[PDB]
Amino acid sequence: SHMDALRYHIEWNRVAEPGTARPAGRLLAVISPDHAGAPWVTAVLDALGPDTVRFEAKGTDRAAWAAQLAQLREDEGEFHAVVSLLAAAEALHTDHGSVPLGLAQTLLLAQALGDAGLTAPLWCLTRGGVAAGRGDVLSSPVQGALWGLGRVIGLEHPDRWGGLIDLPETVDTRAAARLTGLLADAGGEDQLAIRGSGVLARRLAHAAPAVPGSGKRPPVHGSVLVTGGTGGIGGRVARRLAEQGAAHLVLTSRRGADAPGAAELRAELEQLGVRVTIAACDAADREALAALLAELPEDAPLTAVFHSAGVAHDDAPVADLTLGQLDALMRAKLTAARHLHELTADLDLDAFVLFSSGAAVWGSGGQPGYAAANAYLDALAEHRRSLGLTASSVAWGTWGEVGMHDRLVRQGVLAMEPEHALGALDQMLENDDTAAAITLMDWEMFAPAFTANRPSALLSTVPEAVSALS
Numbered sequence: 001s002h003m004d005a006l007r008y009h010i011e012w013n014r015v016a017e018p019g020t021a022r023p024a025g026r027l028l029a030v031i032s033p034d035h036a037g038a039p040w041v042t043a044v045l046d047a048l049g050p051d052t053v054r055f056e057a058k059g060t061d062r063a064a065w066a067a068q069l070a071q072l073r074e075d076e077g078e079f080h081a082v083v084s085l086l087a088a089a090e091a092l093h094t095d096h097g098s099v100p101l102g103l104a105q106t107l108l109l110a111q112a113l114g115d116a117g118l119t120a121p122l123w124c125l126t127r128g129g130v131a132a133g134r135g136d137v138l139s140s141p142v143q144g145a146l147w148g149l150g151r152v153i154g155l156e157h158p159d160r161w162g163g164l165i166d167l168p169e170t171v172d173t174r175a176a177a178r179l180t181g182l183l184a185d186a187g188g189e190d191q192l193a194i195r196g197s198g199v200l201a202r203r204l205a206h207a208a209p210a211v212p213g214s215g216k217r218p219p220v221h222g223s224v225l226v227t228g229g230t231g232g233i234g235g236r237v238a239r240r241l242a243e244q245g246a247a248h249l250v251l252t253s254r255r256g257a258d259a260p261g262a263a264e265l266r267a268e269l270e271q272l273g274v275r276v277t278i279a280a281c282d283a284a285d286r287e288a289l290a291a292l293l294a295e296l297p298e299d300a301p302l303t304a305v306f307h308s309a310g311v312a313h314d315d316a317p318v319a320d321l322t323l324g325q326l327d328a329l330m331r332a333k334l335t336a337a338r339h340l341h342e343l344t345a346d347l348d349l350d351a352f353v354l355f356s357s358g359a360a361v362w363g364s365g366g367q368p369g370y371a372a373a374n375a376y377l378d379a380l381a382e383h384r385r386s387l388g389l390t391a392s393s394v395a396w397g398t399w400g401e402v403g404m405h406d407r408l409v410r411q412g413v414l415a416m417e418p419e420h421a422l423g424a425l426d427q428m429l430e431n432d433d434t435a436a437a438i439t440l441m442d443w444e445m446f447a448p449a450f451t452a453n454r455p456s457a458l459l460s461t462v463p464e465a466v467s468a469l470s
């Protein structure tokens with residue numbers, strides 16, 4: 001339908017076995033020195049071999065790394081590639097409590113490589129940051145955030161970007177040869193997962209047309225929490241839920257009952273019959289969330305979460321983004337969603353819906369922070385599935401009418417009518433799909449623009465993008 005035509009999903013398809021020769025020139029491996037002990041880090045360093053130059057990226061100091069890298073580059077001449085193992089640093093940064101250290105260090109590595117004039121393509125490796133292949137388990141949502149950042153590095157610095165590669169749990173010599181072969185020549189691919197069966201690469205496809213009933217979505221009832229529920233998209237979601245008979249809607253935001261439009265929204269929802277609670281509740285404050293959940297009465301237990309809290313403002317190009325700007329974009333996404341997961345994992349929820357963005361699914365220049373933050377959401381929904389919990393992630397394109405533009409519409413990410421976007425969301429929930437993008441695209445505008453500087457294997461599975469590029 002029209003609503004079906006907004007839904008896309010990510011799939012992973014088999015690509016060519018790589019060649020057998022390792023790279024001719026010298027690799028530079030980047031290690032986070034406090035987080036260099038995971039088995040897959042050892043296995044990758046052993047696969048790169050002992051002639052690989054090693055750089056320990058200590059702390060988060062862009063100017064000190066630029067000077068260290070410039071010396072390496074002077075002494076070695078041109079590297080074949082830079083292979084980052086920084087993703088193994090999952091612990092939170094000591095000064096930026098919503099930023100995984102390896103995410104901070106990956107940003108600063110991309111920055112310092114540019115500053116020093118190292119031009120060799122940067123490859124960011126992860127372990128468990130994607131769910132690729134039937135049955136695969138996304139074990140690290142934190143490393144999954146890195147993929148959101150990496151895709152935006154590829155759009156802002158295409159000439160010095162290699163790609164992303166997720167490693168299996170056991171990096172055997174077949175996996176190792178796949179890795180070193182890809183580093184020699186990746187066949188134009190740049191979003192790759194090495195698995196036992198072969199190498200897979202990431203693809204965007206139209207989602208299957210809706211099948212009513214197929215997901216056995218239970219009737220909306222009980223208490224439903226909508227973070228960011230006082231307005232834009234969260235408010236429209238709340239209205240849909242009230243139309244569909246919710247008993248009690250708990251709407252939160254930092255401003256709560258003081259939010260713009262909040263009183264009008266409460267009155268409109270109440271006219272439908274729904275009990276409304278509005279709370280001023282920072283979604284990343286764990287104690288406030290717990291207090292809100294403790295207030296729910298016996299007769300209206302929590303049945304669903306819709307996580308719409310978030311900001312996109314105060315992002316910046318990769319070359320300029322600060323760790324304090326990245327912490328502020330992460331906080332309502334990573335920190336808040338981690339708390340929502342931890343405090344509801346035992347409640348047997350009917351839905352746990354995380355609102356992501358096209359910035360995280362395909363990438364948007366100028367939005368590295370927002371891409372990382374929303375890629376963490378997508379990765380958490382797949383991780384939660386592996387635990388047997390419900391979860392979904394919905395990556396929006398551009399909304400019309402309400403919510404958070406001119407650049408994006410000009411690049412062919414067109415504004416959706418709210419009712420069509422909401423009806424596409426309902427199709428995803430009735431199917432019980434784990435992940436989708438819901439976006440109106442003009443592919444004839446989007447594909448040539450998005451690929452002007454480097455090809456995108458991601459879009460090869462969208463026939464409208466192939467036709468635009470013909």
Ligand SMILES: NC(=O)C1=CN([C@@H]2O[C@H](COP(=O)(O)OP(=O)(O)OC[C@H]3O[C@@H](n4cnc5c(N)ncnc54)[C@H](OP(=O)(O)O)[C@@H]3O)[C@@H](O)[C@H]2O)C=CC1
Nearest residue numbers: 228232233253254255283308309310357396398399403404
């Ligand atoms: N509009 C669009 O085209 C798209 C939207 N999205 C995503 O959908 C979600 C909703 O966006 P939209 O409605 O358009 O944006 P709005 O700015 O209209 O709504 C976002 C809301 O989140 C609340 N919020 C922000 N930070 C926090 C926080 N730390 N704790 C609790 N609430 C917070 C805001 O209220 P307060 O400031 O009072 O906290 C507001 O209620 C966002 O997560 C966004 O990333 C994704 C793609 C596209």
